[PDB]
């Protein structure tokens, strides 16, 4: 159940172009609403302009897929 | 006095190479140490290593001069 939208979470991150795989999520139901925070793996020879290109990109799809998250920080650090 | 210690933070931390401003510090007193959570800025054209490895010499200068500190978690974002 908390577990069926987690899931569909780092799947809806995943598929974003430069996502190099979930490194960290915390996710918390704020009535029937989730609040979250996300860490992401990126290229560490992307530029901090693009890593943050594809946190927002990560923010817009999950926001667009998961109708009940009402808050998400995306953040990034550098993974193989 | 707080504000004394903060301030000595932020110093530190702005003569570390790469380093584009404090934008964000957290301290708190647990007993008489130091817990610190800091954002820096960088160069958004920076690599993701890059940031990480001015986040590290930021973490190491900040430990060696404010004695006190000790827990310090460095992140970085882009600035100008
Ligand atoms: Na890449
Ligand atoms: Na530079």
Chains 1, 2 share one sequence.
Do not use: F
């Not at 996502?19 to 915390?26: D, M, N, P, S, T």
């Not at 009535?31 to 992307?46: F, H, L, T």
């Amino acid at each position: 159940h908390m577990e069926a939208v987690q899931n569909r979470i780092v799947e809806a991150a995943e598929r974003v172009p430069g996502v190099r795989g979930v490194i960290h999520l915390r996710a918390r139901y704020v009535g029937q609403d989730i609040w979250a925070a996300m860490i992401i793996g990126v290229d560490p020879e992307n530029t901090v302009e693009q890593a943050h290109e594809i946190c927002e990109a990560v923010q817009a799809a999950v926001c667009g897929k998961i109708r009940r998250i009402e808050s998400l920080h995306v953040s990034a650090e550098a993974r193989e």
